[PDB]
Amino acid sequence: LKSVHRWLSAADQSEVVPGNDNIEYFSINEHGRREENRLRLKTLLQQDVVHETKTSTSAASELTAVVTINDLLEACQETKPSISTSELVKLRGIYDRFQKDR
Amino acid sequence: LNAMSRIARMVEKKVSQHNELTGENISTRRWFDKIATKEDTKVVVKMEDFLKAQEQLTPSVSRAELNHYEAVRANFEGA
């Protein structure tokens, strides 16, 4: 979870910066409109709606999520031992008593 | 049971061997049925089996001290 959180934080701008060539646009009579990027996105979405398809391609697992020891050790640092430390002795005693007798 | 375990691991070898020899798709039950022999009852047993079993599990039902002191106290109070 920590590793995927870090990856998502680092990957926010990966899909925003690059240009899109899936469709070509001429932009005539654009004067009088303050919005530029949102209008381009809406035009692209209109064209995609006219040409919508459901199929999608796969991606390499490592660039979706990956496990690293640097975060693993920190996760180990925030310990959460299930067994109650004050209760381990009692449990050990009762387990032994069960094992030896009955 | 220890004996049955040993023989069972033996046949577990055997099956694998034949799977390598005749074919990997042969089912264990099919193999053990076809190659079945009157010697299947050869459930090998020996002293070492007994000693292993004894030292492995189930020391007793009541051995350590319970039996002893109830025995002595019961005999004493029965006078």
In angstroms, what is the resolution?
4.1
Q: Evaluate the CA torsion angle A75, A76, A79, A83 in order and state its sign.
A: positive
Residues 6+ apart with CB under 8 A from A36: none
Residues A78, A71: Cα–Cα separation, whole Å:
11
Experimental method: cryo-EM
Q: Which residues of A lie inside 8 Å of B (Cβ-Cβ)? A: 100-101
**Chain centroid to CA A55:** 21
- B60–A contact, CB cutoff 8 A: no
Does residue B45 sit at the A interface (CB-CB below 8 Å)?
no
3-state SS record for B3-52: HHHHHHHHHHHHHHHHHHHCCCCCCHHHHHHHCCCHHHHCCCCCHHHHHH
Cβ distance of A100 and B64 shorter than 8 Å: yes
A100 vs B64: CA distance, rounded Å: 9
Q: Is the CB of residue B79 less than 8 Å away from at least one CB of chain A?
A: no
